[PDB]
């Protein structure tokens, strides 16, 4: 037991699970991540054909300039100006709070951080996809296969010595000829190597491995080069946007050798890498309700064949019909990779045992669900939710035990709108969520080893990061000609007097009372949210949505002595090992 | 300097030499080993006549069953069952700690790993000799010439997936007429080829080249076939403990054409292969104190002649009287093969320059020296010692600079008993040592380019791998009838709490306090130790001695991210080279 106030102004019993999560994650990654995997799949610079503007012009997301926006920061003077920034361009970080906003030219629909290995102190990058058009929308049952652009954005190193005056740099983009990308998952560890690694001139040092869940119904696997390694090969007369057309390492698809009929699987809707070394398997959820596994190292002539360009086509080794409808989500269990969870548009969650796929461990019928988080330390899964079937006022975010403990679902955050995304930081045991109301919240989970019904009130464990509002000033032009975005950002510096601070009141006046908006584009809506997976920057969070603006925030109040020590202790071992 | 603790629980400054040694060895082997040598000396199956069990029995070691023993492991509740296993029987690997034990039928007196090319991932073997009798002992002055058996033991492949449930398999042995064997060395590189190599029916894919220091005063040079090719040639009805009468590739002896007088050199006592490409020279130490060199490719009719069976006889090209008494050890410099070091029963370590053999580079007088190790990165030599002349309590293991740096001898490990054998791992930068006291000790050397007196307490840099004891429930039978061997192993997985864990507190009574046994067989004495020279399995170690039991260990705490990184990069390159 513990009592009194933590240095950040939360009670110690609210912080104590967070500190426990650091040790469990540090211990886990030492055991079950690795520093190198897939040595065979390093980049080749001659496969990265830089496009001219004439060739690139079809792929660029079509809005050249952001909506007008403004930022108010809690406790600071009111800015009163309106900002508006070009596509592929960024405002500068606020000098004290280091929040950044950058514009991707289209509404964001996938987002993930590159996993830099532990304490390596590297430059930090987010990959993202923003749809070509702000108001185009895609029916699930149809394969789209249009043109679209994967974007990689560099954020600097995000050390305190770097964050004041930081900017997001669009380092390069990959032209994808495979339509919308619905999910991005980097290989969790073992894909990255040092940017100055000595390699023969074509073999650019590898930044990571990125899997793309395409609306074409297939998964593309790219190994990424470091940006400066490209420019060292690239001619210096290049276009300012560094747009590339790129060959896959592999295209993953569902089928068989000589399969005559293209599969009914439809769109690929979700991904998960195997969370443990050697990360050899990838799972994807399809529209037909299947979950499909490709064995990436597979030598076998039955799964692997090489296309005339040299990319691999991989067919799966295992499929099971997990759901009666689209498999909108997957999470793979970190603590034991024989277990998996999936949630589908049939509004069942199903936990799975991959050795015995004929029945789930536990099906729990629920409201329609949009994303799952399965944090390492906890037996259950947290669900983001669509309100369309909820009891009114009881929609929101729910933590659901996998069933052995049998606690009732912990109602961590009531929301009136739908929640489009979750991310759980293993370093924090926090969960953050993006809402169509344009509000971003974070919550600290109670220690789910102990019955959550003993929690006196969940409201003490959550705080808003920001809310977007529209200020007047059913399509994008009918909106942006008549409104600007206001971002209201909280003082994340500490949580003293939290329940009386005005933004925390403002959020509570949104809960239970706020109304769905249906007479405009819902430009405020936040689609994806991601805590940093990296121990360096572990307290950084990135989010964006229907505005196509992407914002980076630092949740300074969860920067803590144990984290800072663990960063430096890990820093020393890295520099003692890799130099 | 670097501060903090590595995740294995050793300080980073203690481990930083161990990590550095991987890079230095890799750069050396890229430049100075080779993929194929002695292309003419491919094994021919018709030279391998399989003995029946009736023919083999005179060559078989006379003990059909091991001494009784038990094995104990730090942190596992004690087993205490008394094992007793037949000649050529292996116990099964411990499912998690992967230690393996098997009985050779006699006391172990020679041992080396088969050198597997970097990245090959091959089956991993030890070739060994074990004396015909547990209690018989041979006078140095005499050419014993009694028959005995060279043994080849396959250890499986030591891949992570293969280590649980592994066993050591006696794949075959060679019936040797030329006396007992005092030393075994493989051709350090370029002998191995793929077991799947297509070759004509008389040829067999070559496992290695092996040279024997016979007590008959001559050196036997064998090319080993891969076992599968023998078993494909062998009739399947034959006895699977296959014992072959093998014709030598070459027989190496001191003399000249028409030299009627048999050489006074007596027994051969130590070998060194030329450590660098093309490995053309083999050096041997002799009882009369000479060091003798054969140029194995030699065409010259003055050095090479072919016997009627087609085996070679080679006379040397150069000799010198290095010592006043038997040359107990040779070590040949890897960094520059002009230099060689030797030790002898006259208890001087002499560093030689083989261009100028009349005067050693340096002669340092010491205690009676039993084996030397010369790790690639370090200028000096580490000496194992008999205690019979030592200043009391100062016996044990010393590292001795070749003299330019001029440091005092680094007293790396005090021992009461005589260290019978020593082995460095160039990959690890660490050394291990077998004692009549029955401990196996391993120790980490500092960066010997810097003054070792800066090491304030070397006890922080060593650990006991195991101790062998006799438990009472002058000859072998009168011993085993009243005692059994207890092997107690440390938890090699990490070095946390090391200086508090009971094996160190026990070992600190082995140092200094331990009263040496002299009144029985010394049945616990460890006569040989060998780290693996192979990048695959580089953290594995083999040991054995008067018990006739081999035991194998994996020093899990020293295998590291750089080891895994390096293994995979070498695996990718090797797979790109051989297909």
Swiss-Prot record, chains A, B:
Part of the TFIIIC subcomplex TFIIIC2, consisting of six subunits, GTF3C1, GTF3C2, GTF3C3, GTF3C4, GTF3C5 and GTF3C6. The keyword Calcium does not apply. The modification Phosphoserine is found at residues 308, 560. This is General transcription factor 3C polypeptide 2. Required for RNA polymerase III-mediated transcription. Component of TFIIIC that initiates transcription complex assembly on tRNA and is required for transcription of 5S rRNA and other stable nuclear and cytoplasmic RNAs. May play a direct role in stabilizing interactions of TFIIIC2 with TFIIIC1. WD repeats lie at residues 77-137, 138-194, 195-246, 247-314, 315-365, 366-401. Its main location: nucleus. The chain holds residues 290 to 890 of 911 of the full protein. It is found in: Nucleus. GO terms for cellular component: nucleoplasm; transcription factor TFIIIC complex. Keywords: Nucleus, Phosphoprotein, Repeat, Transcription, WD repeat. Coiled coil: none annotated. One of its GO terms (molecular function) is RNA polymerase III general transcription initiation factor activity. The keyword Transcription applies. GO terms for biological process: 5S class rRNA transcription by RNA polymerase III; transcription by RNA polymerase III; tRNA transcription by RNA polymerase III.
């Amino acid at each position: 037991h513990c009592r009194g106030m933590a240095p950040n102004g939360l009670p110690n019993h609210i912080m104590a699970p967070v500190w426990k999560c650091l040790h469990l994650t540090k211990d886990f990654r030492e055991q079950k991540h690795s520093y190198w995997e897939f040595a065979e799949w390093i980049p080749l610079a001659w496969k990265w054909h830089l496009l001219s503007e004439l060739e690139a012009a079809p792929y660029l997301p079509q809005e050249e300039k952001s909506p007008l926006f403004s930022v108010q920061r809690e406790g600071l003077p009111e800015d009163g100006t309106l900002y508006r920034i070009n596509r592929f361009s960024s405002i500068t970080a606020h000098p004290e709070r280091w929040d950044v906003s950058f514009f991707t030219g289209g509404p964001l629909w996938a987002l993930d951080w590159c996993p830099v290995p532990e304490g390596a102190g590297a430059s930090q990058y987010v990959a993202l996809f923003s749809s070509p058009d702000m108001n185009e929308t895609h029916p699930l049952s149809q394969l789209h296969s249009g043109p679209g652009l994967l974007q990689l954005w560099g954020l600097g190193t995000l050390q305190q010595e770097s964050c004041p005056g930081n900017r997001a740099h669009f380092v390069y983009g990959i032209a994808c000829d495979n339509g919308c990308i619905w999910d991005l998952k980097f290989c969790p560890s073992g894909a990255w190597e040092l940017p100055g690694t000595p390699r023969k001139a074509p073999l650019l040092p590898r930044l990571g491995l990125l899997a793309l869940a395409c609306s074409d119904g297939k998964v593309l696997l790219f190994s990424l080069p470091h940006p400066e390694a490209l420019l060292a090969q690239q001619p210096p007369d290049a276009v300012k946007p560094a747009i590339y057309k790129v060959q896959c390492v592999a295209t993953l698809q569902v089928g068989s050798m000589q399969a005559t009929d293209p599969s009914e699987c439809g769109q690929c809707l979700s991904l998960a890498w195997m969370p443990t070394r050697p990360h050899q398997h990838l799972a994807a959820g399809y529209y037909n309700g299947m979950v499909v596994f490709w064995n990436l190292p597979t030598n076998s002539p039955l799964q692997r064949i090489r296309l005339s360009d040299g990319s691999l086509k991989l067919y799966p080794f295992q499929c099971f019909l997990a759901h009666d409808q689209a498999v909108r989500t997957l999470q793979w269990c970190k603590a034991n990779s024989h277990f998996l969870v999936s949630a589908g548009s049939d509004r069942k969650i199903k936990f799975w045992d991959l050795r015995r796929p004929y029945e789930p461990i536990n099906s729990i019928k629920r409201f329609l669900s949009t994303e799952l988080a399965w944090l390492l330390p906890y037996n259950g899964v947290t669900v983001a939710q669509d309100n369309c079937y909820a009891s009114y006022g009881l929609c929101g975010i729910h933590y659901i035990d996998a069933g052995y403990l049998g606690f009732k679902a912990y109602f961590t955050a009531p929301r009136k709108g739908t929640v489009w995304s979750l991310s759980g930081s293993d370093w924090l045991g926090t969960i953050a969520a993006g809402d169509i109301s344009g509000e971003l919240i974070a919550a600290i989970l109670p220690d789910m080893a102990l019955n959550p019904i003993n929690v006196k009130r969940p409201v003490e464990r959550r705080f808003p990061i920001y809310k977007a509002d529209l200020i007047p000033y059913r399509t994008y032009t009918e909106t942006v000609n008549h409104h600007y975005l206001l971002f209201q950002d909280t003082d994340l510096g500490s949580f003293h007097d939290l329940l009386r601070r005005e933004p925390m009141l403002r959020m509570q006046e949104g809960e239970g009372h706020s109304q769905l908006c249906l007479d405009r584009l819902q430009l405020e809506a936040i689609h994806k949210v991601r805590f940093s997976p990296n121990l360096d920057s572990y307290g950084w969070l990135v989010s964006g949505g229907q505005s196509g603006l992407v914002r980076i925030h630092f949740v300074r109040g969860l920067a803590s002595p144990l984290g800072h020590r663990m960063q430096l202790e890990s820093r020393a071992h890295f520099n003692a090992m890799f130099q």
